Design a protein around this ligand. Structure first.
Ligand SMILES: [Co+2]
Ligand SMILES: [Co+2]
Ligand SMILES: [Mg+2]
Ligand SMILES: [Mg+2]
Lengths: 359, 364
């Protein structure tokens, strides 16, 4: 199939947006110190880019943008702006590697031209994006990308800001964009209807080169493509590429860092790192399928820093529950006041209570 | 455009599988009474079918199947079996409306013929399904469905048992199957790689007629297409169809019933009913986008029994947190009992997802 030649499923970059999209999470109020811990951990994890809330947003955003650019991280630091010269002047002086010029759908082209050429004159990477791309007029959108491509820009951006796009619709649009522009393509997908990971997958199949993620998917409403969930999907597609590019065994600690800051639990069903992600039912309930449960193990626990699937025969209560999960997570334990805590206190409590501990 | 004629996005049936797939959830140990509560609530909610664990699985499974069939529910009660006569004999006597004959990939066709014709001779709906369909040889699978279609079955089934299938691969396969068989098509998608909802969507676009779900997605590993998530997606596609077919304002109670039984929290990010599903960030963080946050409201709270999006400007702590969520949920508050159990959680440091947890005991 000729179209497989364009697929970027084993050759793409993550733009990690916990410090942009994630700031829109209902309970996210990151201070400078926490953002710095997150940026460092994300860099250690191996993402190519980190995106930050516009330095125009507030005085604290300008300062944090500047501080993060002074860290000497390996990943590139990106931010975004409105299509406006004053915004651009602020962004360029902050030390960022890249600026996204964002519009929402003539006088757009001439204004965008000024902004784009200014940023390029500073030696800074420039991108041009549309907001709510899937509820915009398609021909006007494509004509705008076409013109901006001729001006010369590093990347164009597509965003399903509303969460309404479906996978085949995403594939078709990105595949057309790939034929319209000569540059890289960044994508952003909201998860309101459960499509955020699928939409990311199909975008990559269609030739997109950069995907926005967020740790635990946190963001506006129910958020965007989750970091861990994208990697699980991409890992099944190309195990060797993903296992060697990212430090997958650091994913639990990365999520725990964010979950503590935004005061949430890790959901039981959470991709890879949820309580139940690496579990099989043993016993009479397993006869709801024909093959032995261990036939169905698309994810290998050891690739993600864990030791086994847990085969559940009966309800795990007390220190039996704690011990089983602790051993699956390769925690070496301390064991005293965990079973003493759990008794004076549910299933997701097991992970809650174990959050402190490292493998 | 001609392909749109085959699409079932606004004309499909849900096969609710909380009482089959859901039993494979690591922490699910439903007794007869709990299964009966779940079956009744599912029927009231408006699903067309519920599927139960094979009555062959154990003595109690046989008994619960019988008991659920005696309830007089409106939805049809389905179960599944191995491609074996003894299984079929047991299943038919239970009172079920439908039996799924499941195989995993010439003697298949002979055995399957006997079992299919037996079930049909009892006046019971028969379906024929493959397990792990997306890791099977395509030509053999399609040839098998073709043969079973000629014998005559009510439905054929496709299952991504391993969670590896991708949306376009699903579309392509279902669309081929739709041209191979003349009967209805039931689907089943695991969520290991985050595709279970997308896969259901594309299956329906391609002509599938029946989709398995489970409440909160619960099942083997991280489970299958979640009931609420499918309905959110299908609601955006056709609001009038979904809001009138299902009792969407009952979804929280339905999930709360299962969450209590399998002892989990409702995830903060859960579709529709999660803490944060109907929230916008107000303040300087909203400038991470161009438009007012209220521009992006694909889901309308009132359709799901809720009162508004919560616009968060600052950390909602204490009674402010409780009041905000309680009013969003349309609970009419009892604030002296909810003051008496957070004083008992001083036991530990209290955090965001506990708001929904302490509010579970309350109805709209
Ligand atoms: Co967004
Ligand atoms: Co299954
Ligand atoms: Mg972007
Ligand atoms: Mg089925």
């Amino acid at each position: 199939n000729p179209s497989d030649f364009l697929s970027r499923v084993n050759n793409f970059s993550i733009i990690e947006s916990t410090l942009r999209e994630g700031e829109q999470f209902a309970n996210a109020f990151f201070d400078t110190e926490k953002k710095i811990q997150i940026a460092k951990a994300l860099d250690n994890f191996g993402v190519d880019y980190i995106e930050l809330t516009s330095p125009v947003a507030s005085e604290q955003s300008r300062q944090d943008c500047e501080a993060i650019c002074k860290l000497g991280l390996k990943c590139k630091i990106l931010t975004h702006i409105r299509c406006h010269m004053d915004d651009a002047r602020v962004a360029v002086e902050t030390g960022v590697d890249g600026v996204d010029v964002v519009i929402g759908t003539t006088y757009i082209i001439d204004s965008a031209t000024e902004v784009i050429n200014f940023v390029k004159s500073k030696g800074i990477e420039v991108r041009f994006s549309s907001e709510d791309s899937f509820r915009s007029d398609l021909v006007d959108l494509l004509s705008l990308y076409k013109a901006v491509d001729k001006i010369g820009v590093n990347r164009v951006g597509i965003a399903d800001t509303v969460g309404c796009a479906t996978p085949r619709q995403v594939y078709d649009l990105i595949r057309t964009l790939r034929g319209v522009v000569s540059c890289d393509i960044e994508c952003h997908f909201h998860n309101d209807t459960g499509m955020a990971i699928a939409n990311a997958y199909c975008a990559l199949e269609a030739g997109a080169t950069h995907i926005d993620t967020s740790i635990l998917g946190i963001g506006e409403r129910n958020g965007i493509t989750p970091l861990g969930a994208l990697l699980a999907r991409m890992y099944v597609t190309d195990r060797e590429y993903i296992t060697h590019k990212y430090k997958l065994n650091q994913l639990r600690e990365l999520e725990n860092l964010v979950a503590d800051a935004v005061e949430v639990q890790i959901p039981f069903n959470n991709y890879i790192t949820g309580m139940c992600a690496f579990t099989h039912k043993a016993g009479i309930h397993a006869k709801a399928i024909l093959a032995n449960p261990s036939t169905y193990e698309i994810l290998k626990p050891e690739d993600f820093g864990m030791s086994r699937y847990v085969h559940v025969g009966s309800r795990l209560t007390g220190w039996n529950a704690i011990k089983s999960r602790a051993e699956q997570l390769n925690l070496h334990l301390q064991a005293k006041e965990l079973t003493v805590r759990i008794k004076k206190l549910a299933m997701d409590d097991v992970d809650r209570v174990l959050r402190e501990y490292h493998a």
